[model samples]
Target chain A: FQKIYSPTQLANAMKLVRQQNGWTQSELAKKIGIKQATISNFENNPDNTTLTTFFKILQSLELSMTLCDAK
Target chain B: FQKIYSPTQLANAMKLVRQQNGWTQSELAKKIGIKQATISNFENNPDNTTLTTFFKILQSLELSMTLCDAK
Candidate 1:
């Protein structure tokens, strides 16, 4: 029920959303149907989330994961 | 013990284990088995958690309200 954490990818995605919404942790969490606390953790440490939760949060906000070629 | 936030079953379960070790989130922010900031914000913010971290928290705290009917 969990997926591996990719710091770079996670950070990139987070930056995208944060930039688009201009939302604080609390604001984004509510938008994604999770607690502000959860959002806080996600922003700082996304490793704690399951893939479902991660995708759900993205889906709720109309976000997508972009897989990039390894450099 | 907190229960709620059912989304895609949290992805068939995070798909389980981000390594069972190694994490980030600023030691200055908090610590497991201590401090309110530990779980202050799961995502949109940040939390430093460990396998043992959640295990102990789950054991010490008991907060669960449920409705089970998967049919």
Candidate 2:
């Protein structure tokens, strides 16, 4: 599990996952039911992205989040 | 690794975690910085709960989400 300190880290992680899966932004957007523009926006500027959007994208990528106590 | 079909399932899962931790809704609300009423509303009517709220509450409970390809 990655220890994320901010949403930016989470966003970057998702972007990496997409790349590893060999998915273009458009492909991920279609899978997640969002727009390519939105996916592009998220990849380029995810500072203001909501967790809902993040979760949807992750779900489409077959990603899961696990929480552990911060220590 | 629960297969959640809807947000309601997520809400119920969180409520169970809270109960297992011996916490009341108000306690969890305080911990998550939300109102007790919001927690109550979510537990009872999570049909429209946002993933953002769900993630926050889950984080407070030391819970983490895991995603897998639906199969």
Candidate 3:
């Protein structure tokens, strides 16, 4: 819904999407085959997360990312 | 630019940006304190990539991403 300039914003945005879907952290993690702690950490501290994990979250949330204008 | 629906798309878009910046994988790796193979692996398939690594590349490339809601 907004431009993501940092990992923190991205995390918040994804967390928002999950909430919009009415899925708890554990529910979302269950869909993606990860632990709730992983989702919690990404949402709270987003500094380090695996792409596999991030992409899985995105996919489950039905979100897409747009990459524009490199530089 | 395009909407990234998959991890491979994200990886390829990042690679495209790195190339657009005229930086070789080795140079980028050196700039980011990673091995060339690390970049290679990420650009090919990004499942093993960390958000930290991803953010570093974006910082180096001066690129940003937009998060969008998708059906």
Candidate 4:
């Protein structure tokens, strides 16, 4: 669990997961019905990304968010 | 970790955490500097809720999100 302080941190974390899965930006975009450019934006500059976009990526990547009280 | 399919599910999960902490809607709203109505909408109808708003609430509640591959 990463202690994220910003949306960019979340995006970076997902970017790492995407890399670990050996999927390209285009592949992830296709899975979520978004553009490759959007995937790049999500990974590189996601300050204004929407929750829907983030959730779609999470679902496409088969990831779940576990919420726990901060330490 | 809850297997959530939508934003409403995410919101409802947080609502439960708020309840468990004995915090009312208004109190949570104030903690995040949002209106009570917005908080209500966030809990009951969050289809269009923004990531910024959601993160604010999560931070206020001292919750951190842990991401892992879904089972």
lDDT by residue for model 4 (A1-71), tens: 57675677888889998898898888878988988887787788776666677888888788877676677
Leading candidate by TM-score: 4
**DockQ list for all candidates:** 0.04, 0.22, 0.66, 0.55
Residue-level lDDT tens digits of model 1 in A1-71: 11213443454455566677676766666766778776556556754554445554555445543221122
* Per-model RMSD to reference: 13.0, 3.8, 2.4, 2.0
Instruction: State model 1's lDDT.
Output: 0.40
Q: What is the TM-score of each candidate against the true structure?
A: 0.38, 0.65, 0.81, 0.84
Better of 2 and 4 by TM-score: 4
| Residue A19 accuracy (lDDT) in model 2 | 90
In model 4, what lDDT does residue A24 have?
88
Candidate 4, position A47, lDDT: 67
Off by over 4 Å in 1: A1-5, A66-71, B1-71
Residues B1-71, model 2: lDDT tens digits? 46654455566777877897898888778887978887787788876554446656776777655444444
Q: lDDT of each prediction vs. the true structure?
A: 0.40, 0.67, 0.79, 0.79
**Against the true structure, candidate 3 has what lDDT?**
0.79
Candidate 1 lDDT over B1-71, as tens digits, reads: 12223432321122121112233333312443454444333322222333223322322222111221121
Point out where model 2 deviates above 4 Å.
A3-7, A40-55, A65-71, B1-6, B44-52, B65-71
Q: TM-score, chain A, per candidate? A: 0.59, 0.86, 0.86, 0.86
Off by over 4 Å in 3: B30-37
Which whole-number lDDT from 0 to 100 does residue B25 have in model 3? 86
**Candidate 3 residues A1-71, lDDT tens each?**
65566778889889888887798988888877989898899999887788878877887787778875444
